[PDB]
Structures are given as structure tokens and as C-alpha cells.
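Worked example (supplementary).
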Amino acid sequence: LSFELLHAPATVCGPKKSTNLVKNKCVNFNFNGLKGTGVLTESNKKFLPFQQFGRDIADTTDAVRDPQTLEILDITPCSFGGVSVITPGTNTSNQVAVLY
Amino acid sequence: KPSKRSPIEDLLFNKVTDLICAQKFKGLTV
Amino acid sequence: TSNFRVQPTESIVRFPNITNLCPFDEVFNATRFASVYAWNRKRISNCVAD
Amino acid sequence: QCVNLTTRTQLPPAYTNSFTRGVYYPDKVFRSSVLHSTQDLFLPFFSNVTWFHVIKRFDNPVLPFNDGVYFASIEKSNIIRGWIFGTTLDSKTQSLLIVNNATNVVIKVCEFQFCNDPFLDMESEFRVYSSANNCTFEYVSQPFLNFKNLREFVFKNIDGYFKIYSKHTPIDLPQGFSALEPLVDLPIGINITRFQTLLALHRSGWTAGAAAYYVGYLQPRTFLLKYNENGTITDAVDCALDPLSETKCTLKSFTVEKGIYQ
Ligand SMILES: *[C@@H]1O[C@H](CO)[C@@H](O)[C@H](O)[C@H]1NC(C)=O
Ligand SMILES: *[C@@H]1O[C@H](CO)[C@@H](O)[C@H](O)[C@H]1NC(C)=O
Ligand SMILES: *[C@@H]1O[C@H](CO)[C@@H](O)[C@H](O)[C@H]1NC(C)=O
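After joint prediction of all chains, the assembly is encoded as:
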């Protein structure tokens, strides 16, 4: 077996793998180049045959198509936010409250 | 009306009008 | 004071429904070969080689 | 074996104007109810394109392939069949052939010879090439399918990839708007400078359906396209034509209100 390598897209590269996906969970995900993080969920969007993934007004990846069941999923980055501390003066007490 | 507003206040509210999620899901909060 | 973020707990990978294997069977499991003076040459492209 | 005749009548072809035709999805991305501005190779609006008619009068000239070609065909009974692509079109370099068989389409890129006036003889005889040397790439797929048939194609070639976009329509091109979804991509990587077309003529009282085809050339331009709630491109605006369109792009909207804009 001899390998001919040229300045070509190299149509013979090898096999890929797969793993059972998860939904409604914060998880790092990969999709045939598209690789990000977020939460996967069933989508109500109705793509058309040759469209693979979707974008939004912010020009960011929003929806993807699973290349094993021809279904549409949505992605939402895992939750985040600032935190604040409510407290009376330390001259008075030491109890605090936390606001997310 | 439940809002307990006046006939006018209602028109002012109605006259003045999902990019919010997109901006939010980038690092900016309101 | 500070921030709060939720971290992922898993990593997932997905790819197309892999099929269309290269025709190695016609090479290795052929009915008959040819002699040394007629060594057989086969070209393989546009297929996923297992 | 081809016979060379000296009875052809020299007559320059016709000219017509493309109004709002030649719009294709420039990517595989989904967008809904959004006005998006892109820069790519498009066909300028209201542009002169060349008109050939075939019925005697034979019309299969040789024309350049500068950057990309928009090919329109108005026809009945499926006369136009295939295409030829290449640079010098002989056994000195590889050539690309697309042929629509009765139940398939075949694409072949390799060395070839052709007549000075190649032609194809229902189908009983197939002879357009005399020699077929070692062929780098083969491809087989499904068939692509006043006058009632209209076929619009866009052929491009860049970065070592050759792309064909297609659309069919049952109905001097008519008005309206039509999108041309991507059809096929090929990793060939040829130099491509010229191209030829193919039709089917059969010897035969006898009736031969006429056909007409329009050829237009692309150009790098900036367009503003509208995506509906489904994802279908329903309208587009080119903003190097007239001041009103340029204002429409600079405002990133289709309707312009009263005022003075810079
Ligand atoms: C994917 O491949 C499997 C394996 O043969 C097949 O059973 C299935 O129908 C294919 N399509 C899917 C899962 O959409
Ligand atoms: C453009 O087309 C019109 C009519 O089709 C013609 O009169 C004119 O000469 C053309 N201009 C060119 C080919 O530059
Ligand atoms: C757009 O999507 C809606 C809902 O899916 C559908 O009813 C409609 O036929 C689609 N096309 C147009 C042109 O509205």
C-alpha cells in the first residue's frame, strides 16, 4: 500500500468517531468543525435540506443539525452573571446576604 | 384596567416601542 | 464583588453516518492474483478506508 | 469522424438584459428574517447578456470563462444535455465533461479529443470524443431534471473547487425573483479558460423543438439580501447601480424615509 500525497484536498483521510449526545445539560460539544459550549435542546426551527447550522442577528452560531438523525438542535451558553453582597455595617453585625 | 393608568398614559405607553438575548449572551447585562 | 459561571461536565463528539468503505476486499480477498511480471495496481480515492 | 461543412451562415447573436436574475445562496448558513450584506461574485442587475437560439442555423460558438458563468435555457423536450470545460480542449491537457445520461449524470476529467464542431447524434449513438486517456476523477449522480421549461445554472471555479448551482422553473426572460440553491461541488483544480455546450439533435413530418440559451458573466459585487422567517432569500439589492440603492444599503434597510443622507 503506497500513499500518493499531493496539493489536493486529500479525499482519503480516515474514519471519525461518535458518542451518544446529551440534552438540557451544560456540556462542551463538537460538530464536524463547529466546536463550542452550551446547552443542547430540541429546536422548533424548520431548516431546509442543504442548510447545516444557523446564525442569529449577533452573527454567532445558534442552531446546529445532528449529522446522524437529521434533526435540529439549539445551543445556549451555560448561565453566568455577577454577584452582589448586601450587608449592614460591620460595626453592627456580621450577617450578609447574597444576590445573584 | 389592572395597570391603574389613565386613558392618556396608555397611549404614551403603547406608542413607544430578540436582540436582547443575543447581546446578553455575549457578556453584557441590563 | 465578583462573577459566577457554570462549567461543563462532559465532552461530546458527532460526525456523519460513516459508510462507503474503500474496496479493500477486491484487493486482499480477490479470487486470483496475477504473476510478478503482471503485478496488479489499484487506485483508491473518495472513500473512507477502514 | 466528423464532416466539415462550408454552408454556415455568419450572424452575430442577440443581446438581452438580465433584470433580477442570478441570485444564489453564498454559503451553507441559516438566517431568518434578517437583512444581510455580503460581498461575492454576483451578476449585476439590468446587465447585457448574450442570446443564442438553436432550431440550418447552428449556434455552438466558443466563448471565454473569465470568472464565472450564468447559463439560462428556455426549452421544451430536453434538447440541451451537457457541457465541456477546459483551456485548449485537446489531448495536450485535461478537460472536464458533464453529460446527462438518460438515467444519470456523468462528470469526467481527463485527456480528450473532440471535433472542431462536436455534436451528439431517444439516444442510440454516443460519439463526441475519440480518445480517453487516464482519468483522474469520475463522478456519477442522478439526472438534473411558447416554451414551458426554464433552467438556470451558475458555474464557478476558485481555490481548486468547481461549483454548480441550479434551478428549474415551469412557466426575453421574465421578471420576478428566483434563488439558485447550491447543487454540486467538485475538487478538480483545473486552469479553465473556455467552455462548450451540448444539445441533442436526431435525424428524422419531422418536428424538432427549438431552444434558446442566454450567457452572462459574473463580477465581484456587494449585495444586500433579505431572509424571511423560513430562510428563503426573497429579495436582494445591488448597491453600485443607482443612488437610491446605495442609500438603501448605507441605511441597511429597504425603505428610505424623507430626508437628506450622506
Ligand atoms: C445511520 O446508520 C445506521 C447504521 O446502518 C442506520 O441503521 C440508520 O438508519 C442510519 N440513519 C440514521 C440513524 O438516521
Ligand atoms: C446593451 O443591450 C442593448 C439592447 O439589448 C444594446 O442596444 C446595447 O448596444 C448593448 N450595449 C452593449 C452591448 O454594450
Ligand atoms: C414560512 O413558514 C411558515 C411556518 O413554518 C409556513 O406556514 C409558510 O408556508 C412558509 N413560507 C412562507 C412564504 O411564508
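Two points are worth noting when inspecting this output. Chain A touches chain B through eight residues (CB under 8 Å). The radius of gyration of chain A is 23 Å.
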